[PDB]
Amino acid sequence: GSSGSSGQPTAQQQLTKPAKITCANCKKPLQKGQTAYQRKGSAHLFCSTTCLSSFSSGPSSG
Numbered sequence: 001g002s003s004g005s006s007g008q009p010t011a012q013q014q015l016t017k018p019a020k021i022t023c024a025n026c027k028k029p030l031q032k033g034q035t036a037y038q039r040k041g042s043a044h045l046f047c048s049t050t051c052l053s054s055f056s057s058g059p060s061s062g
């Protein structure tokens with residue numbers, strides 16, 4: 001005979017949704033109005049190209 005778990009224990013606490021917007025690279029408070037950069041099929045914004053590119057990590061389980 002034998003046994004198993006086959007369970008997925010999940011439980012975390014965090015803010016349902018953010019209040020303000022920040023760069024996904026430098027994490028800077030983008031003033032309301034300033035233009036933001038967004039990649040294709042992605043929900044991440046950036047302050048400027050310099051970051052948009054920097055963020056890109058590469059071939060890492062992605």
Ligand SMILES: [Zn+2]
Nearest residue numbers: 023026047051
């Ligand atoms: Zn940035």
